[PDB]
Design an enzyme around this catalytic site. Structure first.
Site, PDB file in Angstrom:
ATOM      1  N   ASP A   1      -6.268   8.272  -0.471  1.00  0.00           N
ATOM      2  CA  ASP A   1      -5.816   7.278   0.491  1.00  0.00           C
ATOM      3  C   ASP A   1      -4.619   7.841   1.283  1.00  0.00           C
ATOM      4  OD1 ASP A   1      -7.627   5.456  -0.709  1.00  0.00           O
ATOM      5  OD2 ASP A   1      -6.067   4.460  -1.782  1.00  0.00           O
TER       6      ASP A   1
ATOM      7  N   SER B   1     -11.553  11.010  -3.785  1.00  0.00           N
ATOM      8  CA  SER B   1     -11.101  10.656  -2.427  1.00  0.00           C
ATOM      9  C   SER B   1      -9.602  10.488  -2.541  1.00  0.00           C
ATOM     10  CB  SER B   1     -11.715   9.411  -1.955  1.00  0.00           C
ATOM     11  OG  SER B   1     -11.345   8.296  -2.793  1.00  0.00           O
TER      12      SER B   1
ATOM     13  N   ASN C   1      -7.521   9.177  -5.608  1.00  0.00           N
ATOM     14  CA  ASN C   1      -8.364   8.262  -6.362  1.00  0.00           C
ATOM     15  C   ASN C   1      -9.157   9.027  -7.396  1.00  0.00           C
ATOM     16  OD1 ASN C   1      -8.776   7.047  -3.031  1.00  0.00           O
ATOM     17  ND2 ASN C   1      -7.506   6.107  -4.562  1.00  0.00           N
TER      18      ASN C   1
ATOM     19  N   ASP D   1     -12.310   9.032  -7.955  1.00  0.00           N
ATOM     20  CA  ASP D   1     -13.594   9.551  -7.418  1.00  0.00           C
ATOM     21  C   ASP D   1     -13.412  10.890  -6.654  1.00  0.00           C
ATOM     22  OD1 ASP D   1     -12.622   8.595  -4.988  1.00  0.00           O
ATOM     23  OD2 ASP D   1     -14.254   7.192  -4.516  1.00  0.00           O
TER      24      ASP D   1
ATOM     25  N   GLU E   1       0.852  -1.231   0.000  1.00  0.00           N
ATOM     26  CA  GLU E   1       0.000   0.000   0.000  1.00  0.00           C
ATOM     27  C   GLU E   1       0.876   1.265   0.000  1.00  0.00           C
ATOM     28  OE1 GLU E   1      -2.987   0.429  -0.613  1.00  0.00           O
ATOM     29  OE2 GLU E   1      -3.890  -1.567  -0.340  1.00  0.00           O
TER      30      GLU E   1
ATOM     31  N   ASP F   1     -15.627  -4.548   8.894  1.00  0.00           N
ATOM     32  CA  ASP F   1     -16.803  -3.980   8.153  1.00  0.00           C
ATOM     33  C   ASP F   1     -17.620  -5.042   7.417  1.00  0.00           C
ATOM     34  OD1 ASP F   1     -18.248  -1.419   7.578  1.00  0.00           O
ATOM     35  OD2 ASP F   1     -17.516  -1.547   5.525  1.00  0.00           O
TER      36      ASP F   1
ATOM     37  N   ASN G   1      -8.866   5.313   3.059  1.00  0.00           N
ATOM     38  CA  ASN G   1      -9.567   6.206   2.113  1.00  0.00           C
ATOM     39  C   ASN G   1     -10.537   7.159   2.755  1.00  0.00           C
ATOM     40  OD1 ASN G   1     -12.036   6.372   0.133  1.00  0.00           O
ATOM     41  ND2 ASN G   1     -10.149   6.383  -0.989  1.00  0.00           N
TER      42      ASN G   1
END
Ligand SMILES: [Cl-]
Ligand SMILES: [Cl-]
Ligand SMILES: [Cl-]
Ligand SMILES: [Cl-]
Ligand SMILES: [Cl-]
Ligand SMILES: [Cl-]
Ligand code: NA
Length: 129
Positions: A52, A50, A46, A48, A35, A101, A59
């Site tokens: 990280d 967003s 990202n 969209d 990562e 989650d 995120n």
């Protein structure tokens, strides 16, 4: 801070990741390697809008507030900048929420693609733990 492999493994152990939700410590060190290259300061935007953040590339769409991801959530109740600290507490605490989650460590694309199904104990080999 850019951690060494075993230094990160120790920090992650101490903060309770080893076997957290059934993921052995190697899976977390592996995820961090791919990562962020073990860099607490790593950021990646990202498509969209967003971003990280941190050693586990958490995120802003869901997990932290960065003030520039409209209509996102902040489930970890932290500024994203908290995830860039040399102290990985915030990152680990938020990773525990993520992995709980439903999707486990599949939340981390680098873990799914480079760690899942591999010999992840390799990442903690040689470490004093
Ligand atoms: Cl080290
Ligand atoms: Cl390494
Ligand atoms: Cl392991
Ligand atoms: Cl963002
Ligand atoms: Cl730490
Ligand atoms: Cl799972
Ligand atoms: Na957010």
């Amino acid at each position: 801070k850019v951690f060494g492999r075993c230094e990160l493994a120790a920090a992650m152990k101490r903060h309770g990741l080893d076997n957290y939700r059934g993921y052995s410590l190697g899976n977390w060190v592996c995820a961090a390697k791919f990562e962020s290259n073990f860099n607490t300061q790593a950021t990646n935007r990202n498509t969209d809008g967003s971003t990280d953040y941190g050693i586990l590339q958490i995120n802003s769409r869901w997990w932290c507030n960065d003030g520039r991801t409209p209509g996102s959530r902040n489930l970890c109740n932290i500024p994203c900048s908290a995830l860039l600290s040399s102290d990985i507490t915030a990152s680990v605490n938020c990773a525990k929420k993520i992995v709980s989650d439903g999707n486990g460590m599949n939340a981390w694309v680098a873990w799914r693609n480079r760690c899942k199904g591999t010999d992840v104990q390799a990442w903690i080999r040689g470490c004093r733990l």
